[PDB]
Write an enzyme that holds these catalytic residues in place. Structure first.
Site, short mmCIF file in Angstrom:
data_model
loop_
_atom_site.label_atom_id
_atom_site.label_comp_id
_atom_site.label_asym_id
_atom_site.label_seq_id
_atom_site.Cartn_x
_atom_site.Cartn_y
_atom_site.Cartn_z
CG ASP A 1 -1.99 1.03 1.19
OD1 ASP A 1 -1.53 2.31 0.60
OD2 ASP A 1 -2.81 0.77 1.87
NE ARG B 1 -4.55 3.82 0.66
CZ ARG B 1 -5.36 3.40 1.30
NH1 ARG B 1 -6.56 4.06 1.12
NH2 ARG B 1 -5.49 1.96 1.85
#
Lengths: 173, 173
Positions: A126, A128
């Site tokens: 991920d 982010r």
């Protein structure tokens, strides 16, 4: 409200919506992404905060997929009834973008399994970052907040900018 | 796989509150992730299909805005193509190619009662939107004739270069 370390803040503006009357304000990270905060005119010292990663299919196209379908809408209904903010971050597809997310969908449609799909598109971790959301929280001078999320990485990131009480967001359960 | 200016994703199914669509991402080659255009279409659409060339408008598209600038437009176009057959070509060109930050500032000036000449000057406003990537998309789907759902002569004029166009009016307000 000027700039803070390559983050520019727009004026606030009224936005009448089907959920009620909000204000909106843009935070341009210059690189270059126009994030948006949607907030009710008054919110408390411990507001309901939704940190939302852009998902065009659920947000704009009425998708019924459980990945993100109904989530933005649910959050706007909730801050509307209760007061609060939606912090709309431009980080489509966990940071790898819409193009790859569409290919991930098509792989799922053809019946590849989760690991095969990830392998084929290339999504490792991920990607982010939520620190930009921390700056937005300081701008609004939010010290404690109820975060609508089921993601411990979002919880973990914002607790060094404020006091976080978790609250689940179950749209599709 | 590439074209001229665009890279094309696989096609993916999208179940929505409006019906079942397919979607396909068209990414401008060498773009950072901010030019992931999306086509939303119905299975096996006709030889004179309804086409909505939609300029991204976060407030209208995703936030339930009741403003007439773009409120309801995306929803209306998805309802219509679902019933009649066709495509929405969703182009990432928020704020007339000038962006969300400026659009929010433009809204704030309208809130304060500046008139339209004053707001433009203060924001630094030319409509910077190019539609030629929509032409490549039309070529990719081999659409040589269409009903273009719009009130913008520049969209019409631009797409006339790639296909025979019949205008259909978009009435939201």
């Amino acid at each position: 409200q000027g700039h803070m370390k390559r983050l520019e803040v727009s004026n606030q503006a009224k936005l009448p919506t089907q959920f009620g009357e909000f204000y909106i304000q843009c935070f341009r990270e210059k690189g270059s992404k126009d994030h948006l905060v949607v907030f009710t005119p008054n919110f408390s010292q411990n507001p309901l905060v939704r940190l939302h990663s852009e998902c065009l299919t659920g947000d704009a196209l009425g998708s019924q997929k459980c990945d993100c379908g109904g989530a933005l809408q649910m959050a706007l209904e909730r801050i509307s009834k209760e007061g609060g903010l939606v912090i709309y971050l431009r980080q489509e597809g966990r940071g790898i973008g819409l193009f790859n997310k569409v290919n991930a969908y098509a792989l799922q449609d053809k019946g590849y399994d989760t690991i095969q799909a990830n392998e084929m598109i290339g999504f490792k971790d991920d990607e982010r970052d939520y620190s930009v959301a921390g700056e937005i929280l300081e701008y609004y001078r939010i010290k404690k907040m109820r975060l609508l999320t089921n993601n411990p990485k979002k919880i973990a990131a914002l607790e060094k900018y404020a006091e976080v009480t978790r609250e689940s967001l179950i749209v599709c359960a």
